[PDB]
């Protein structure tokens, strides 16, 4: 199934864990986009005092991501594999809007979206859309249209703290290798060499100036308030 041309899909969801599907809420395109694009932004704090040659830079935030792509709808009859329909592209666009745009009275909002094509997998919200109608039948039925789309990114707050596995607050263990000293190991774990007598008391060490090269030590966290 390497030889199969895969087509892009969009599915709508009801919950923020993406496990409860909206009924009849799946869109499949008939022509793939040419390309797609991502955007990444990191913000810093850049205040400095006058008279100085450089500023003290501090990380502030990671801003949300962005995806963009374009679509083409056409039912003229020159693309192999598809049929000409009596009403053209009317039902294709109406089903596409019901999935990505329309307000849902069960959840009091528009839908959660999952976008999958090949290696790509993206969860989020619609922000912007433009649809332009190009060709028509003599009685005013449209047969060609072009759409531009912008998607934001969604992370649930319970999953953000699990991805930022934030760790002087937790407990730690190491094994002593030959070449280790107690004040150098304390500096790499706490940021300061001065806690070496508290690490030695918590492990029952008397001759801490010579460590034996199979010992497993504990490193307790610092106390708060």
């Amino acid at each position: 199934s390497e030889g199969k041309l895969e087509k892009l899909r969009i599915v709508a969801y009801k919950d923020s864990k993406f496990s409860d599907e909206v009924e009849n809420g799946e869109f499949i395109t008939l022509l793939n986009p040419e390309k797609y694009k991502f955007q990444y932004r990191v913000e810093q704090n850049e205040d400095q005092a006058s008279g100085t040659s450089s500023a003290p830079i501090r990380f502030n935030k990671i801003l949300p991501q962005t995806l963009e792509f374009d679509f083409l709808f056409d039912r003229t009859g020159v693309i192999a594999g598809y049929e000409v329909t009596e009403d053209g592209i009317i039902n294709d666009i109406d089903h596409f809007k019901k999935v990505v745009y329309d307000y849902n009275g069960e959840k009091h909002k528009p839908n959660y979206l999952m976008i999958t094509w090949g290696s790509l997998l993206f969860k989020g919200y619609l922000k912007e859309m433009d649809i332009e109608y190009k060709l028509f039948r003599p009685d005013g039925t449209p047969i060609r249209a072009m759409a531009t789309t912008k998607i934001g990114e969604f992370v649930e707050e319970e999953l953000r703290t699990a991805q930022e596995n934030n760790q002087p607050d937790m407990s730690h263990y190491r094994t002593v290798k030959e070449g280790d000293t107690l004040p150098l190991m304390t500096y790499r774990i706490y940021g300061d060499s001065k806690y070496y007598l508290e690490v030695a008391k918590a492990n029952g060490l008397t001759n801490f100036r010579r460590l034996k090269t199979g010992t497993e030590l504990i490193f307790p966290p610092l106390q708060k308030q």
């Binding site: 508290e198 690490v199 030695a200 008397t206 100036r209 610092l222 106390q223």
Partner: protein, 97 residues
């Protein structure tokens, strides 16, 4: 008789023999008072200062063992307190008169 959570204090300051930084400052103060006519360079590349820091570290080690509790410092290899103390069963009871 349950296990408690274990942590380490953050105010590492005592102004005694277990306080490395305290000892180092006192060392330098004494040096100036006694020998500043000849020894004035107190930068970190100086062998003199290097020796001082090593000795301060050694002092902390000594102080730390002095604080080991009595139960261990006077323990016997086989356990017990035979040559150190008389026990209540032996030293408190009285002959009946």
């Amino acid at each position: 008789t349950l296990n408690k959570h274990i942590s380490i204090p953050k105010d590492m300051s005592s102004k005694d023999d277990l306080d490395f930084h305290f000892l180092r400052e006192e060392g330098i103060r004494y040096i100036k008072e006694l020998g500043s006519n000849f020894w004035t360079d107190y930068n970190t590349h100086d062998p003199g200062i290097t020796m001082l820091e090593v000795l301060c570290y050694a002092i902390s080690d000594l102080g730390n063992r002095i604080n080991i509790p009595i139960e261990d410092l006077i323990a016997n290899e086989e356990g017990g307190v035979k040559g150190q103390f008389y026990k209540v069963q032996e030293i408190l009871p009285s002959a009946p008169t």
